[PDB]
Each structure stands twice: as C-alpha cells, then as structure tokens.
Amino acid sequence: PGSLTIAGSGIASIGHITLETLALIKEADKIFYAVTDPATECYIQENSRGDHFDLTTFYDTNKKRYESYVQMSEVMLRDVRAGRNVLGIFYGHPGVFVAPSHRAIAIAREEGFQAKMLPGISAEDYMFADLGFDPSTYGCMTQEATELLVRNKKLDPSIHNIIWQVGSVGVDTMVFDNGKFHLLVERLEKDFGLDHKIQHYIGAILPQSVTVKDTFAIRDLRKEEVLKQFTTTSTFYVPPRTPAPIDPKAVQALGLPASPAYGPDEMRAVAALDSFVPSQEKAVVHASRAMQSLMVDLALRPALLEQYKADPVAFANTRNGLTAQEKFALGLKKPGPIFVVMRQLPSAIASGQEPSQEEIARADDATAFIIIYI
Amino acid sequence: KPGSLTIAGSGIASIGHITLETLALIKEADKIFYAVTDPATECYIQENSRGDHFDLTTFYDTNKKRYESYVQMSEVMLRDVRAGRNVLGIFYGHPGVFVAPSHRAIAIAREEGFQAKMLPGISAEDYMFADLGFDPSTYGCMTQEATELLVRNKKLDPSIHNIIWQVGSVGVDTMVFDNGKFHLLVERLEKDFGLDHKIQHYIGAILPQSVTVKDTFAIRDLRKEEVLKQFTTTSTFYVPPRTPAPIDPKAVQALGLPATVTKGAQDWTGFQSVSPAYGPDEMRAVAALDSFVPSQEKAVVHASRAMQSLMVDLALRPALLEQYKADPVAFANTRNGLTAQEKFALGLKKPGPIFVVMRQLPSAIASGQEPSQEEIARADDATAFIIIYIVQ
Ligand SMILES: Nc1ncnc2c1ncn2[C@@H]1O[C@H](CSCC[C@H](N)C(=O)O)[C@@H](O)[C@H]1O
Numbered sequence: 226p227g228s229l230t231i232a233g234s235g236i237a238s239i240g241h242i243t244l245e246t247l248a249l250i251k252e253a254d255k256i257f258y259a260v261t262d263p264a265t266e267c268y269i270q271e272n273s274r275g276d277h278f279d280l281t282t283f284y285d286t287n288k289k290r291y292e293s294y295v296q297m298s299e300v301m302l303r304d305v306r307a308g309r310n311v312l313g314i315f316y317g318h319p320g321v322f323v324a325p326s327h328r329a330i331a332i333a334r335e336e337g338f339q340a341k342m343l344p345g346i347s348a349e350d351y352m353f354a355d356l357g358f359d360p361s362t363y364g365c366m367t368q369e370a371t372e373l374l375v376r377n378k379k380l381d382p383s384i385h386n387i388i389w390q391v392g393s394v395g396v397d398t399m400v401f402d403n404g405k406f407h408l409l410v411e412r413l414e415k416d417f418g419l420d421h422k423i424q425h426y427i428g429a430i431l432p433q434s435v436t437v438k439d440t441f442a443i444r445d446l447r448k449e450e451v452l453k454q455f456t457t458t459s460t461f462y463v464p465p466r467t468p469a470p471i472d473p474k475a476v477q478a479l480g481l482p483a484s485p486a487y488g489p490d491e492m493r494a495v496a497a498l499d500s501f502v503p504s505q506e507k508a509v510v511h512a513s514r515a516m517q518s519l520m521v522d523l524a525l526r527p528a529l530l531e532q533y534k535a536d537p538v539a540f541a542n543t544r545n546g547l548t549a550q551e552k553f554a555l556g557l558k559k560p561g562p563i564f565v566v567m568r569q570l571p572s573a574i575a576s577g578q579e580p581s582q583e584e585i586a587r588a589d590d591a592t593a594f595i596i597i598y599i
Numbered sequence: 600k601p602g603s604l605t606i607a608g609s610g611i612a613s614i615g616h617i618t619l620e621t622l623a624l625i626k627e628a629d630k631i632f633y634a635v636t637d638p639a640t641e642c643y644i645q646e647n648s649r650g651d652h653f654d655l656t657t658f659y660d661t662n663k664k665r666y667e668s669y670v671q672m673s674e675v676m677l678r679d680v681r682a683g684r685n686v687l688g689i690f691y692g693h694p695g696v697f698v699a700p701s702h703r704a705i706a707i708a709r710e711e712g713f714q715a716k717m718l719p720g721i722s723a724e725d726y727m728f729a730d731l732g733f734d735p736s737t738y739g740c741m742t743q744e745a746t747e748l749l750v751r752n753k754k755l756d757p758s759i760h761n762i763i764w765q766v767g768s769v770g771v772d773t774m775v776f777d778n779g780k781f782h783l784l785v786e787r788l789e790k791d792f793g794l795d796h797k798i799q800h801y802i803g804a805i806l807p808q809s810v811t812v813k814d815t816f817a818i819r820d821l822r823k824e825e826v827l828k829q830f831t832t833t834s835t836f837y838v839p840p841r842t843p844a845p846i847d848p849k850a851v852q853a854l855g856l857p858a859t860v861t862k863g864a865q866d867w868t869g870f871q872s873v874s875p876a877y878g879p880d881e882m883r884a885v886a887a888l889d890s891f892v893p894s895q896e897k898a899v900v901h902a903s904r905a906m907q908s909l910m911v912d913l914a915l916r917p918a919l920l921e922q923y924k925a926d927p928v929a930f931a932n933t934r935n936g937l938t939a940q941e942k943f944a945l946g947l948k949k950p951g952p953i954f955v956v957m958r959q960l961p962s963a964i965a966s967g968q969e970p971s972q973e974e975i976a977r978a979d980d981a982t983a984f985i986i987i988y989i990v991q
Pocket residue numbers: 236315316317318319320321322323346347348349388389390391392426427428429430457458459460461986987988989
C-alpha cells in the first residue's frame with residue numbers, strides 16, 4: 226500500500242525544479258529532503274502538505290557518512306512500510322553521486338512496494354550550460370576523485386573528463402581540510418603534464434552566487450592561494466589534451482564520406498534563409514483544447530495517468546470535448562496515433578479533412594519521433 | 600531595451616521535465632524558437648507563451664545538409680536578439696548536449712555584446728540513471744556516441760559504467776535510419792566484453808502513452824533479427840562494468856582511509872555482486888537511528904515572508920535579478936517587510952550571510968536572540984553549502 230518516489234531539486238535554488246516534481250511536492254503525504262540552501266528548503270516546505278523531514282539531520286562532524294546514508298534510507302523505508310506515499314527529494318539529480326536514494330528504491334522493491342526515481346538537473350548538466358561544451362564531441366568521462374584514486378585509475382587525455390568531489394579527497398566523515406588534495410594533483414600531473422589547463426567550476430546555487438569558471442594550469446594546483454578555492458562544492462573540468470585521430474578505414478567501413486562565424490558556407494545558408502521552401506509540406510500542431518488539457522493532465526497528474534492506463538477508452542470518454550479521431554487515437558494507448566492526430570498537414574486542415582482511422586492506427590511508434598541530433 | 604538570448608531545454612518526457620525557470624521564461628519571453636520531439640510539449644510551449652513563436656524544425660529537408668539547417672536556426676534567433684527582443688530558444692533534452700545551433704548562437708551573441716545564457720535541461724543520460732537505477736559515481740561512467748567511438752578507434756573500458764548514444768543510427772544520419780552498420784558496434788562490444796556480457800537497451804518514455812524500454816541482452820543476442828528490430832533513433836545502451844578494478848589497500852592507506860575500506864560504493868542494478876541490504880554495519884546504523892543526538896545543536900530554517908518572497912522572485916524573475924545585482928541595497932529597500940538584519944545581509948550580495956539570516960538555532964529562536972551584524976558579515980561563503988551524499 227505504501228510507495229516511494231525519489232526526485233531532485235536541481236542545483237540552482239528553486240529554478241531547476243521540474244514541473245512533475247513540483248506537482249509531486251504539492252500532493253505527497255510525506256516528504257524527506259536533503260537540499261543545500263534555505264530558500265529551496267522553505268519553498269519545498271511551503272508548497273507541501275506540511276509533513277516533511279530534513280534528512281541532513283543525520284550528519285555529524287566526525288560521524289561516518291555511510292552511517293548517515295543508511296539512516297536517511299531507513300526513515301523513508303519506515304514510512305513506506307507504514308503505508309505512506311513517500312516522496313524523497315535530493316539536491317541535483319537524486320541518482321547522481323547519491324547513495325541513499327538507490328539503496329531505498331532497491332530495498333523497497335525487494336520488499337514488494339512500488340518505488341521509482343525521477344531525474345533532476347545535475348551539477349554536470351549545469352556545467353555543460355555554464356562552461357558551454359558538448360560532451361558528445363569527444364565523449365565524456367565522469368568520476369569521483371576518491372574513487373578514482375582508491376582503484377588506481379588513470380585519466381584518458383583524449384576525451385572530456387569531469388572530476389567530482391575534488392574537495393573531499395579521502396574524507397569519510399564531515400571534516401574537509403583538503404589534506405589529501407595533493408594526491409589528485411599527482412594523478413593530474415602524470416596524465417596531462419604540468420602545462421595543461423583545467424577549469425574550476427562552481428555553478429551558482431543562490432541569486433547571490435557568482436558562477437566560478439576559473440582556468441588553472443596544473444602547475445599552479447599546489448599553490449596555497451589556489452588550493453584554498455577548492456571546496457566541497459567544486460568540480461573540475463579537464464578538457465582533452467590530445468583528441469584521438471580519425472581512422473579513415475573506420476570512416477569508410479561506416480559508409481561515411483572521406484573558425485570564423487560567417488564564412489562562405491554560413492553566408493550562403495543565411496542568404497537562402499528567407500526564401501527556403503521545404504520539398505514537401507510539413508505538418509503543424511492541430512489539437513483541440515480537450516486534447517491539450519488531457520495531455521497536460523497526464524503529464525502532471527499521476528492519479529489521472531493511472532486511470533488512463535487502466536482503461537484508456539473509458540478515460541477518453543470522460544473528455545467529451547475530444548474530436549472523434551482524438552478519442553480513437555487515445556483509446557489505442559500508443560505514441561504513434563498521438564502524433565497523427567495532434568499534428569496535421571495545413572492542406573488537410575484547410576480542407577476540413579480529418580485523419581482516417583487507417584492513418585491514425587497505421588502510425589509507426591518507433592519513427593514518429595524526429596531526432597536529427599541538432 | 601537591449602536584446603538578449605537564453606537557450607533552454609524541454610527535457611525528455613513530455614512537459615513534466617520542464618524546469619520552473621524555463622516555464623517562467625516561456626511565459627515572459629518576447630519570442631520563442633523551439634525544436635521539440637512531441638506535439639504535447641509543442642502545444643504546451645505555445646499555449647503558455649505570449650504567442651510569438653517559431654518551429655526551428657521547419658529548416659530541415661531531405662537533400663539539405665543538416666549544417667545549413669543549423670546555421671539558419673542560429674540566425675533566426677540572432678536576428679531577433681539584434682532587433683532588441685528577449686529571445687528564448689528551447690531544444691529537446693538538455694540544449695547543450697548534441698545540439699550544434701545552441702552553442703553557435705550563444706557564442707555569436709556574446710561576440711556582438713549581448714547577454715546570452717544557456718539553461719540546463721534534463722538529458723537522456725539523466726533519464727537513464729533514474730530509469731535503470733545506477734549512479735555514474737560508483738565505478739565512474741564514460742558516455743559517448745556510437746559512430747564517434749568507431750570513427751576514432753576508441754576501446755571501451757570494461758571496468759567502468761559505459762553509456763553509448765545513437766546506437767540506432769550507426770554511421771549515418773539522414774532519415775533512412777537503416778541500421779546497416781550496427782554490426783560494427785557489436786564487434787567493438789564483443790572485443791571489449793566478450794559474448795556473454797549483458798547490456799541494457801534503454802528508451803525513456805516521451806509521451807504518457809510511451810512505455811519505458813529497459814531490456815537486458817547478452818552481446819551474443821545483438822546479432823539476432825528479433826533483437827535488431829528493437830533499436831530505434833531514441834535508443835541508448837547501458838553497458839555495466841564487467842571487470843571493476845579492486846580497491847587497492849595501499850591507495851586506501853595513502854588516502855588516510857581506514858583499512859576497513861575493501862569495497863567501492865554499492866550498485867543495486869543486479870549486474871554487480873550485491874551485498875546484503877542489512878549486514879552488520881547497516882544494522883548498527885539502523886539501531887543507532889532513534890537515539891542519535893548530534894555533537895552540536897543544528898540550525899533550522901527561519902526566514903520571514905519578505906525574505907522568502909524575495910528569494911523566490913530572484914529565482915524566477917530575471918528582470919528583478921538584474922535590478923538586485925545592479926544595486927542590492929536599493930533593491931532590499933523596496934521590500935520593507937524585511938528585517939534590518941535581512942536587509943543588511945542582502946546588501947552584501949554574498950551567499951554566506953543569507954544562511955545566517957535564513958537559518959537559526961532553535962535555542963536562539965526560543966530566546967528571541969537575533970544574529971549580530973558582525974556575525975552576518977563574517978559568514979564564510981566557502982563553507983556555507985554542505986553537499987555530500989556518497990562515500991567509499
Ligand atoms: N553548484 C555546484 N557547482 C559545481 N559542482 C557542484 C555543485 N553542486 C554540486 N557539485 C558537484 O557535486 C558534488 C556533490 S554530490 C551532488 C550530486 C547531486 N545529486 C547532483 O546531481 O549534482 C560536489 O563535490 C561537486 O563535484
């Protein structure tokens with residue numbers, strides 16, 4: 226009867242919370258949260274039904290963090306076992322560099338309860354936006370500073386590297402003095418050399434915060450005045466030193482063919498813009514108010530989504546503002562039909578021509594989603 | 600009336616992944632340019648907007664270079680910025696992950712002296728961690744595109760988590776999306792992991808009607824016709840570690856960690872050996888829970904309505920944030936519900952003072968003792984935030 230949902234608050238105070246998460250906060254029976262700033266904390270409390278618990282109460286200066294984490298999981302699990310519909314909220318993404326979330330979800334499931342995790346905005350998400358790089362260009366390795374040292378890993382200088390928790394190297398309690406930071410520096414020196422530059426990143430949590438994105442040569446990382454800047458909030462971005470060369474054999478096997486802002490190619494693209502006409506008519510959105518209302522409700526109201534999934538035809542029949550085609554599409558409970566009814570050709574719209582049941586039902590689920598990784 | 604450019608994401612799931620700051624900007628922006636994957640998200644953007652919007656996907660066409668399309672996408676945004684409009688661009692997922700026109704527009708805007716910002720959104724990777732239930736930190740996590748992995752002749756490291764994007768269209772974009780080169784990725788997987796190792800095929804649900812795909816396949820299976828048929832343009836692979844590196848006791852020693860550290864942090868997916876949920880160490884922590892008393896009294900949130908109202912406003916209203924930043928003292932003086940202490944803290948425009956006025960000891964609250972101006976001003980920014988949720 227009890228259940229567990231664990232969601233995130235993101236990084237920036239209030240702004241990074243997702244719409245589905247705010248909806249959960251408003252409806253939940255009980256909220257356990259671990260956030261980093263008072264404005265976010267207050268915002269969660271004030272939007273809630275008023276039954277909440279601060280998970281950070283389990284930390285202590287010289288207490289092993291592992292003990293705190295087990296306790297955080299346990300208070301959530303106790304309420305699940307008691308039959309509450311429990312929401313956990315963790316700073317950032319609740320599954321990224323978080324021990325108690327995955328633990329609680331696994332244990333809940335093992336014991337036969339419904340449990341799920343929702344994504345949130347992570348520190349890496351914030352970093353890509355703030356530092357303005359695309360991880361897909363060379364590939365991107367994520368690692369925790371202590372973990373990489375305890376397992377004697379080497380960093381690959383051909384890719385993007387992101388190193389988290391640089392401010393807590395070798396610490397298992399809550400005392401952070403940078404006493405072992407020099408061990409990470411040694412790793413960096415060996416893998417990248419002394420002249421390679423890294424970026425020290427701290428994304429702005431409060432309005433009063435200023436984004437930190439300072440560059441430091443590795444040769445400067447043992448300086449007292451540099452060292453002092455690395456806190457428990459700090460992440461390092463280490464750009465590639467030596468991207469791996471293209472292999473022409475691989476390119477060929479893949480069937481692939483063998484800077485100024487406004488070069489000739491760009492100037493051509495711009496000149497052609499105002500007159501460009503597609504080779505074929507593109508569909509535009511064409512959805513009734515009823516359809517839009519329903520689709521928003523299904524996105525933001527779990528109770529309604531549950532009812533829809535249990536009996537889609539019946540649920541469609543509760544929204545009589547839907548067109549006949551919309552009702553049919555919704556009754557099928559498949560993604561493709563939704564695309565067919567909600568997006569139509571302007572030529573057909575002008576002709577009063579509604580999509581046929583054949584057109585609706587024939588929709589391919591797989592290739593309805595247009596992703597040309599822009 | 601200077602133009603400005605903000606690029607945001609829609610996230611992956613229809614509507615629900617949009618961030619509060621993003622919705623706020625949808626409502627307030629002069630003009631919105633968007634490229635999203637589903638019609639419910641598209642309609643939601645339109646219906647919440649000031650009604651001036653443009654679908655960037657209109658620039659796509661067969662026999663048209665994608666790059667030309669991207670330059671045009673950047674240009675329509677920049678034109679409106681130059682004209683003095685408050686411009687919002689929105690892309691599927693996170694707008695900086697596999698999106699070329701976003702980075703380009705921001706760079707040019709900044710070069711020409713405009714304020715230009717990217718906002719994070721929920722990525723496919725983010726959705727995967729939540730749906731498949733692993734943490735990149737436990738073993739480390741390498742994320743890369745299938746074609747690029749092959750083109751640069753990279754090896755997959757079997758000791759870490761691996762995420763592979765774009766498995767559904769190896770070696771070709773286009774629209775034909777015939778996965779005729781997929782076997783080259785399978786070869787790579789076979790070489791690095793062997794045939795018996797298991798991968799997960801992941802598709803996160805976009806629409807309410809979508810069902811999450813999280814099927815496990817042995818690498819042996821990836822050549823089977825009934826398996827190949829499953830892979831699509833929204834497919835991602837998760838490859839769990841096969842051979843994680845052991846904890847080095849000498850490294851543990853050098854790090855000053857106790858000799859009791861013999862294992863990394865726990866992964867719960869079932870791909871790794873999974874310790875009992877309630878072993879002796881866990882039972883100890885649970886038994887200690889009810890009677891735990893911290894070494895020193897902990898502060899609790901304690902903030903005025905005026906302070907909370909202001910802090911929400913600054914998070915959600917860029918024009919107000921701009922005003923505050925320009926003159927924090929004058930701004931605080933427009934909110935006379937603030938205490939003298941709050942006004943002072945806000946005037947410093949630093950995070951550390953905020954913690955002093957927005958959190959207080961329950962003992963100090965009971966006695967009615969307010970924090971001193973000296974206490975507020977001496978607050979250390981570098982130790983205000985406590986952010987640590989894993990350990991070895
Ligand atoms: N504001 C911020 N700027 C940069 N890195 C940050 C940050 N907040 C957290 N981090 C990173 O995250 C680590 C704490 S663990 C926090 C993880 C959180 N669930 C998330 O999704 O991000 C820090 O040591 C640092 O490496």
